Amino acid sequence: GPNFSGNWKIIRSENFEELLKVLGVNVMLRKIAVAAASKPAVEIKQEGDTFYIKTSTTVRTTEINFKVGEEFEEQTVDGRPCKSLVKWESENKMVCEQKLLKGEGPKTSWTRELTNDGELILTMTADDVVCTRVYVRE
Ligand SMILES: *S(=O)(=O)Oc1ccc(C#Cc2ccc3c(c2)C(C)(C)CCN3C(=O)CCC(=O)O)cc1
């Protein structure tokens, strides 16, 4: 498949706030999240099926480490600890399902796809809401 490695820059975002709202994030925290996510830095180091992904804004940094096909810990988009599994849906697209570590909640998932034109699309899902974030490589 194509190499996801590099520094990625946001060019288009749909329904990030809508997604946080259906997850019950309060309006003050949603506005901070939308402002922060307006200029993120995404660093991906891909070694075959092994991924390091660092997502940084001024207010929040996540670092995840996963092998496609092995369970790992991360957080949901609204910052709840979860156990995740990634699988390849195609050469170009990984899909991830998240189970909360404690309690129940809505079913959350993400997908990351490297398009034929070099765009990285992240989709994040909860209930009927689909958030799409499109990046280009710096
Ligand atoms: S892309 O890869 O650029 O997409 C992307 C995904 C998520 C984010 C983000 C974010 C974010 C920023 C601030 C906060 C949050 C998320 C929460 C978890 C929803 C809570 C509100 N909030 C804060 O309170 C500040 C940070 C924190 O939780 O400690 C960026 C880019």
Side-chain angles (χ1 to χ4, degrees), residues 1-66 68-82 84-106 108-138:
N3 187 11
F4 284 73
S5 302
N7 297 305
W8 293 86
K9 297 303 197 213
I10 196 76
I11 56 158
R12 299 192 299 283
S13 179
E14 308 197 335
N15 303 332
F16 182 50
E17 194 178 353
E18 187 176 30
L19 174 69
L20 294 183
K21 180 168 185 171
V22 295
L23 288 174
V25 179
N26 71 52
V27 58
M28 188 195 75
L29 296 191
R30 289 195 321 264
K31 293 314 181 167
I32 285 156
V34 160
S38 73
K39 185 185 170 214
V42 178
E43 179 187 33
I44 299 174
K45 314 198 286 236
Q46 182 185 6
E47 289 192 45
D49 281 346
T50 302
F51 285 82
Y52 168 79
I53 301 183
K54 183 182 190 193
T55 303
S56 65
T57 67
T58 306
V59 300
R60 180 180 170 83
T61 299
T62 66
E63 284 184 284
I64 68 179
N65 287 287
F66 67 89
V68 175
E70 308 195 350
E71 296 175 9
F72 67 102
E73 293 191 353
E74 58 169 352
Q75 298 198 341
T76 61
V77 66
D78 66 312
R80 288 175 75 180
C82 65
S84 292
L85 185 61
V86 181
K87 82 181 167 170
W88 291 108
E89 169 178 301
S90 82
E91 293 180 9
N92 288 5
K93 181 168 183 186
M94 71 190 86
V95 304
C96 181
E97 183 188 328
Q98 303 179 322
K99 301 194 186 300
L100 294 165
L101 290 198
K102 294 200 317 200
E104 266 80 292
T108 60
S109 64
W110 60 256
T111 76
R112 283 185 171 94
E113 165 176 33
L114 220 180
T115 72
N116 207 29
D117 48 39
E119 282 166 359
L120 170 69
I121 310 175
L122 164 75
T123 77
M124 296 172 286
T125 294
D127 287 11
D128 302 323
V129 177
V130 177
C131 171
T132 64
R133 299 203 25 118
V134 184
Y135 309 79
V136 300
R137 197 184 233 146
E138 187 199 36

Coordinates of all heavy atoms in Angstrom, one line a residue, residues 10 16 20 25 29-30 32-34 36-37 40 42 55 57 59-60 76-79 112 122 124 133 135, ligand 1:
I10 N -4.2 20.0 7.6 CA -5.6 19.9 7.3 C -5.9 20.9 6.2 O -5.5 22.0 6.2 CB -6.4 20.3 8.6 CG1 -7.9 19.9 8.5 CG2 -6.3 21.8 8.9 CD1 -8.1 18.5 8.7
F16 N -16.9 18.2 12.5 CA -16.2 17.9 13.8 C -17.0 18.4 15.0 O -17.1 17.6 16.0 CB -14.8 18.6 13.7 CG -13.9 18.3 14.9 CD1 -13.7 17.0 15.4 CD2 -13.3 19.3 15.6 CE1 -12.9 16.8 16.5 CE2 -12.5 19.1 16.7 CZ -12.3 17.8 17.1
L20 N -18.7 16.1 18.1 CA -18.5 16.3 19.6 C -19.8 16.5 20.3 O -20.0 16.1 21.4 CB -17.5 17.5 19.8 CG -16.1 17.3 19.3 CD1 -15.3 18.5 19.6 CD2 -15.4 16.1 19.9
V25 N -20.2 16.5 24.3 CA -19.2 17.5 24.8 C -19.9 18.8 24.9 O -20.7 19.2 24.0 CB -18.0 17.5 23.8 CG1 -16.9 18.5 24.2 CG2 -17.3 16.1 23.7
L29 N -16.2 23.5 25.5 CA -15.1 22.5 25.1 C -15.2 22.3 23.6 O -14.1 22.2 23.0 CB -15.3 21.3 25.9 CG -15.1 21.4 27.4 CD1 -15.0 20.0 28.1 CD2 -13.8 22.2 27.7
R30 N -16.4 22.2 23.0 CA -16.5 22.1 21.5 C -15.8 23.3 20.9 O -15.1 23.0 19.9 CB -18.0 22.0 21.1 CG -18.6 20.6 21.5 CD -19.9 20.3 20.9 NE -20.8 21.5 20.6 CZ -21.9 21.8 21.4 NH1 -22.1 21.3 22.5 NH2 -22.7 22.8 20.9
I32 N -13.5 25.2 21.8 CA -12.0 25.2 22.0 C -11.5 24.1 21.1 O -10.5 24.3 20.4 CB -11.7 24.8 23.5 CG1 -11.9 26.0 24.4 CG2 -10.3 24.3 23.6 CD1 -12.1 25.6 25.8
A33 N -12.2 23.0 21.0 CA -11.7 21.8 20.2 C -11.7 22.3 18.7 O -10.7 22.0 18.0 CB -12.6 20.6 20.4
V34 N -12.7 23.0 18.3 CA -12.8 23.4 16.8 C -11.7 24.4 16.5 O -11.1 24.2 15.5 CB -14.2 24.0 16.5 CG1 -14.2 24.8 15.2 CG2 -15.3 22.9 16.5
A36 N -8.8 24.7 18.1 CA -7.5 24.0 18.2 C -7.3 23.2 16.9 O -6.2 23.2 16.3 CB -7.6 23.1 19.4
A37 N -8.3 22.4 16.5 CA -8.3 21.5 15.3 C -8.2 22.3 14.0 O -8.0 21.7 13.0 CB -9.5 20.6 15.3
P40 N -3.9 21.9 13.3 CA -3.3 20.8 13.9 C -1.9 20.5 13.2 O -1.7 20.9 12.1 CB -4.3 19.7 13.7 CG -4.8 19.9 12.3 CD -4.9 21.5 12.2
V42 N -0.1 16.9 12.3 CA -0.2 15.4 12.3 C 1.2 14.8 11.8 O 1.5 15.2 10.7 CB -1.4 14.9 11.5 CG1 -1.4 13.3 11.5 CG2 -2.7 15.4 12.1
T55 N -0.8 13.6 17.0 CA -1.8 14.7 16.6 C -1.6 15.8 17.6 O -2.0 15.5 18.8 CB -3.2 14.1 16.5 OG1 -3.2 13.0 15.6 CG2 -4.2 15.2 16.1
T57 N -2.4 19.9 18.8 CA -2.9 21.3 18.8 C -2.3 22.0 20.0 O -1.7 21.3 20.8 CB -4.4 21.3 18.8 OG1 -4.9 20.9 20.1 CG2 -5.1 20.5 17.7
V59 N -3.8 23.0 22.6 CA -4.4 22.6 23.8 C -4.3 21.1 24.1 O -4.6 20.7 25.2 CB -5.9 23.1 23.9 CG1 -5.9 24.6 23.8 CG2 -6.8 22.5 22.8
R60 N -4.0 20.2 23.1 CA -4.1 18.8 23.3 C -3.2 18.1 22.3 O -3.3 18.4 21.1 CB -5.6 18.3 23.1 CG -5.8 16.9 23.2 CD -7.3 16.5 23.0 NE -7.5 15.1 22.9 CZ -7.7 14.2 23.9 NH1 -7.7 14.7 25.2 NH2 -7.8 12.9 23.7
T76 N -11.0 8.0 22.7 CA -12.1 8.4 21.7 C -11.8 9.9 21.4 O -11.0 10.5 22.0 CB -13.4 8.2 22.3 OG1 -13.4 9.0 23.5 CG2 -13.7 6.8 22.8
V77 N -12.4 10.4 20.3 CA -12.3 11.8 19.9 C -12.7 12.7 21.1 O -12.1 13.8 21.2 CB -13.2 12.0 18.6 CG1 -14.7 11.8 18.9 CG2 -12.9 13.4 18.0
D78 N -13.6 12.3 22.0 CA -14.0 13.1 23.1 C -13.2 12.7 24.4 O -13.5 13.2 25.5 CB -15.6 13.0 23.4 CG -16.1 11.6 23.7 OD1 -15.7 10.6 23.1 OD2 -16.8 11.6 24.7
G79 N -12.2 12.0 24.2 CA -11.1 11.8 25.2 C -11.3 10.8 26.2 O -10.8 10.9 27.3
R112 N -8.8 5.8 8.3 CA -7.7 6.6 7.6 C -7.4 6.0 6.3 O -7.2 4.8 6.2 CB -6.5 6.7 8.5 CG -6.6 7.7 9.7 CD -5.3 7.8 10.4 NE -5.3 8.8 11.4 CZ -5.6 8.7 12.7 NH1 -5.9 7.5 13.1 NH2 -5.5 9.7 13.5
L122 N -9.2 11.2 7.2 CA -9.6 10.6 8.5 C -11.1 10.8 8.6 O -11.6 11.9 8.4 CB -8.9 11.4 9.6 CG -9.5 11.2 11.0 CD1 -9.1 9.8 11.5 CD2 -8.9 12.2 12.0
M124 N -14.3 10.0 11.3 CA -14.6 9.6 12.7 C -16.2 9.6 12.8 O -16.8 10.5 12.2 CB -14.0 10.6 13.7 CG -12.5 10.6 13.7 SD -11.8 11.8 14.8 CE -12.1 13.4 13.9
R133 N -12.0 14.6 7.9 CA -10.9 15.6 7.9 C -9.9 15.1 6.8 O -9.5 14.0 6.8 CB -10.3 15.6 9.4 CG -11.5 16.1 10.3 CD -11.2 16.8 11.6 NE -9.9 17.4 11.7 CZ -9.7 18.7 11.9 NH1 -10.7 19.6 11.9 NH2 -8.5 19.1 12.1
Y135 N -6.4 15.9 4.7 CA -5.1 16.4 4.8 C -4.3 16.2 3.5 O -4.5 15.2 2.8 CB -4.2 15.8 5.9 CG -4.9 15.7 7.3 CD1 -5.9 14.8 7.5 CD2 -4.6 16.6 8.3 CE1 -6.5 14.7 8.7 CE2 -5.2 16.5 9.5 CZ -6.2 15.6 9.7 OH -6.9 15.4 10.9
Ligands
LIG1 S1 -6.6 15.7 12.4 O1 -5.9 14.5 12.6 O2 -6.1 17.0 12.4 O3 -7.9 15.6 13.3 C1 -8.0 16.0 14.7 C2 -8.7 15.2 15.6 C3 -8.9 15.7 16.8 C4 -8.4 16.9 17.3 C5 -8.8 17.5 18.5 C6 -9.1 17.9 19.5 C7 -9.5 18.4 20.8 C8 -9.1 19.6 21.3 C9 -9.5 20.1 22.5 C10 -10.3 19.3 23.3 C11 -10.8 18.1 22.8 C12 -10.4 17.6 21.6 C13 -11.8 17.3 23.7 C14 -11.1 15.9 24.1 C15 -13.1 17.0 22.9 C16 -12.1 18.0 25.0 C17 -12.2 19.5 24.8 N1 -10.7 19.8 24.6 C18 -10.0 20.3 25.6 O4 -10.5 20.4 26.7 C19 -8.6 20.6 25.4 C20 -7.7 19.4 25.4 C21 -8.0 18.3 26.4 O5 -8.8 17.5 26.2 O6 -7.1 18.2 27.4 C22 -7.6 17.6 16.4 C23 -7.4 17.2 15.1

